[PDB]
């Protein structure tokens, strides 16, 4: 409305000065704009220069537009409506400016406005844009489509929200009118728009699906890459949610996608390749592939080679390899006749790129085809071992990974034939001069450590020699993997790590990196998780190290809780904290408490850990509760004297976290209640027992959750209970003989004495591999008691019948 000459000359002057090649003039223009941007009339001038000053050249008009855009995304709340509306009007009025740079700038402006200040503060953006599609001038329709496309991209919840009153029941049938359109750009926009609303199963589209699918087929023949790409990705998404609709055309579709997977445009080929990934998740995959699988496997295998440019994330190679992995899991051994001739031509090829693809294939199919591959492994594994010292780094690294994919088989064979040389050469490769090899080797060794477990004990010194040595060699990316390897080693070899030499060489560099990291460095996550395992493993010895670690961890929990409260108080000024610092800190405290046990009392005596835990147990985030209940169980065992005052408060929460939807929260709560039981509690039993019985009869997690529930129910055995013995026995008969099993069986003996039942499982379960004498006498006293109280015992399998004469017949 009111641009005056002095103002215009001054702002144009500032834009010219901002375009100076001189670096100092730029920095002071920066502070000058810094000040000016907070005055709305300045924004009025900026938009005026963008849209009205035809006189000025394009980079000036565009720079004005972009500065304005930055202001509209750090200061838009404080914009009054008169200026906002002047910008809005001028944008929609200039959306099709004949300069591409101006057009693009206006576009960023529109989309950034819609973004920062939500789509309803602009009630009429979409309607005008939509009507602007029908306009004559090409640039106008192109610009409007571009804007809509961006809006649909990031503002996708336009249908599920319904804030602007069904903002898609108009647009979608309008996009589908433009599939037919003469210009490739507009077709592309139309499809890219619609595509945003497929996986959501958006009503407006779903009730137009036939028109959609038909127009897509009509488009299949299009040679403009962006259209092919978008059709391809349309079909891929459609395949996930409306399978029914495309069954009748699947043969022709598979033919099309298989053609496009071989497309010369990398992007088309990649979008096509997604088809195999998502098709492999549908149960009709085999039936649909019967006519095409023989061609499909070699195309994927061939696409798994590194690209020419890659020889220097998601790409054709990775997609193809993932597709092969899933197909291997679908077809299992039926795939091997398709894949073995390719492997024979690839694994020994003289061109390293081809060999590399072969090793990749060999790894990819491992999970699905493991059984079928066993016959060939006595030849392939030694060969892979040789490849570990291939002179091409990318061969070494992929070999590392594939071997790790066959670690189980390697471990199950005699150690000297495969395991020993593999571990030796993996260790060598950990100290490779190539960083990709280094991390591949460390990761693969971690996987092997995990599978081998105790089988590593004899090589412990050489392993530690290498892992420690890696500290001085490794950069940042790779220290993370190194910590994971140390952690898994400690978990694998347990207490065997507790030797003075090992502690002295391992701990100092761990503390060294501990001292470098600040409480805000995410690189704490692997180190602390490593320390937790080391602490649990080093049981006796860590003592000289616990103090700073305990304090720092507790402190991290404290400051996390603080930041969370502060953010809950003022979200617009204080960042929500990353709760992983808290989860990891709890997890290390759990490990410390398990390792040191009772010897952590002195540290807990000086601590508010229980008061922090009280808030952790009530956290919204499941992993925080799971960690806090774990720490609760460990401290219950280690130093109950500090916990007892809190039990009356803690128990109703444990009672409210016996929800099997969260397996590990429910589990850790249950375990906690078992440990606390042993230290105690009649009034708390009713709030927990019914749920535990529900959990033990539930047809899910027939493993660790049920055993702990059983143990806990067993522990709650020292009460007047009133079945559940069927799954209890079923669950507990399969666990190793330890203290927990003892406690639970004492409970079942006391409980049977009070309400004797007519479903012997107990007897089958009673077959203890060497129970302590008092527990045995309890058993044979109850058994003998029943015998004093057959055709039924005829049904005992021989091992049972025989065992129950050695101890109690």
């Amino acid at each position: 409305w009111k641009p005056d000459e002095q103002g215009l000359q001054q702002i144009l002057q500032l834009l010219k000065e901002s375009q100076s090649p001189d670096t100092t003039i730029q920095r002071t223009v920066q502070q000058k704009l810094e000040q000016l941007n907070q005055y709305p009339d300045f924004n009025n001038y900026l938009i005026f220069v963008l849209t009205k000053l035809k006189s000025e050249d394009e980079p000036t008009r565009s720079l004005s537009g972009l500065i304005l855009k930055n202001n509209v995304k750090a200061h838009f709340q404080n914009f009054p409506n008169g200026v906002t509306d002047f910008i809005k009007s001028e944008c929609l009025n200039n959306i099709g400016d004949s300069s591409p740079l101006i057009r693009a700038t206006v576009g960023i402006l529109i989309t950034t406005i819609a973004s920062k200040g939500e789509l309803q503060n602009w009630p009429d953006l979409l309607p005008k844009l939509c009507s602007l599609l029908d306009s004559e001038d090409y640039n106008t329709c192109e610009g409007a489509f571009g804007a809509l496309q961006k809006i649909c991209e990031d503002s996708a919840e336009i249908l599920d929200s319904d804030v602007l009153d069904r903002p898609l029941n108009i647009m979608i049938p309008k996009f589908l009118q433009f599939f037919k359109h003469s210009s490739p750009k507009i077709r592309s926009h139309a499809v890219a728009c619609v595509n945003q609303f497929i996986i959501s199963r958006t009503q407006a589209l779903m009730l137009h699906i036939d028109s959609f699918i038909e127009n897509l087929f009509a488009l299949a023949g299009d040679e403009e890459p962006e259209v092919r790409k978008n059709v391809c990705r349309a079909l891929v998404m459609l395949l996930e949610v409306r399978m029914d609709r495309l069954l009748p055309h699947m043969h022709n579709i598979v033919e099309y996608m298989l053609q496009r997977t071989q497309d010369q445009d990398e992007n088309v080929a990649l979008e096509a390749c997604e088809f195999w990934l998502t098709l492999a998740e549908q149960p009709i995959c085999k039936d649909v592939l019967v006519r095409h699988l023989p061609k499909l496997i070699p195309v994927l295998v061939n696409g798994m080679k590194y690209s020419d440019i890659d020889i220097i994330d998601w790409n054709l190679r990775k997609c193809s390899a993932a597709a092969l992995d899933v197909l291997a899991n679908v077809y299992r051994d039926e795939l091997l006749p398709h894949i073995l001739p390719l492997l024979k031509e690839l694994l020994f090829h003289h061109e390293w790129v081809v060999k590399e693809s072969g090793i990749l294939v060999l790894g990819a199919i491992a999970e699905g085809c493991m059984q079928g591959m066993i016959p060939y492994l006595p030849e392939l594994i030694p060969h892979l071992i040789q490849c570990l010292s291939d002179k091409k780094a990318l061969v070494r690294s992929i070999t590392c990974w594939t071997l790790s994919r066959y670690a189980h088989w390697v471990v199950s064979q005699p150690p000297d034939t495969y395991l020993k040389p593999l571990m030796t050469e993996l260790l060598k490769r950990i100290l490779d001069s190539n960083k990709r090899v280094q991390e591949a080797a460390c990761s693969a060794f971690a996987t092997l450590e995990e599978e081998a477990c105790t089988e590593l004990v004899p090589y412990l010194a050489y392993i530690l020699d290498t892992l420690v040595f890696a500290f001085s060699k490794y950069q940042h990316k790779n220290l993370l993997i190194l910590y994971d390897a140390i952690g898994t080693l400690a978990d694998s070899v347990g207490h065997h790590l507790n030797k003075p030499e090992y502690i002295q060489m391992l701990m100092p560099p761990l503390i060294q990196k501990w001292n470098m990291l600040k409480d805000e460095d995410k690189d704490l996550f692997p180190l602390l998780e490593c320390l937790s395992s080391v602490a649990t493993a080093l049981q006796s010895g860590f003592l000289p190290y616990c103090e700073p670690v305990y304090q720092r961890c507790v402190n991290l929990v404290q400051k996390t809780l603080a930041q969370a409260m502060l953010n809950n108080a003022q979200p617009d000024q204080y960042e929500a904290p990353d709760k992983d610092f808290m989860i990891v800190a709890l997890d290390l405290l759990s490990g410390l408490a398990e390792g040191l046990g009772g010897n952590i009392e002195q540290l807990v005596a000086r601590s508010n850990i229980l008061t922090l835990m009280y808030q952790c147990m009530q956290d919204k985030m499941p992993e925080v509760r799971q960690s806090s209940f774990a720490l609760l169980g460990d401290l219950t065992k280690a130093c109950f004297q500090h916990v007892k005052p809190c039990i009356a408060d803690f128990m109703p929460i444990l009672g409210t976290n016996l929800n099997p939807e969260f397996i590990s929260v429910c589990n850790n709560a249950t375990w906690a209640i078992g440990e606390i039981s042993i230290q105690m509690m009649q009034p708390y039993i009713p709030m927990v027992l019914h749920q535990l019985v529900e959990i033990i009869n539930r047809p899910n997690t027939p493993k660790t959750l049920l055993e702990n529930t059983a143990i806990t129910i067993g522990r709650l055995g020292y009460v007047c209970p009133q079945q559940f013995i069927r799954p209890w026995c079923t669950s507990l008969r399969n666990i190793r003989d330890n203290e927990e099993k003892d406690s639970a069986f004492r409970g079942i003996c006391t409980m049977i004495s009070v309400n004797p039942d007519f479903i012997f499982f107990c007897d089958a379960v009673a077959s203890w591999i060497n129970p302590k004498d008092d527990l045995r006498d309890m058993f044979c006293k109850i058994l003998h008691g029943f015998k004093n109280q057959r055709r039924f015992s005829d049904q005992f399998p021989l091992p049972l019948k025989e065992r129950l004469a050695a101890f109690y017949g």
Partner: peptide, 19 residues
């Protein structure tokens, strides 16, 4: 019998993978 922790899963997530 005992607590469930996520350490191992977190390490597998961080582990090097070709795809």
């Amino acid at each position: 019998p005992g607590k469930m922790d996520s350490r191992g899963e977190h390490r597998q997530d961080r582990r090097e993978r070709p795809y």
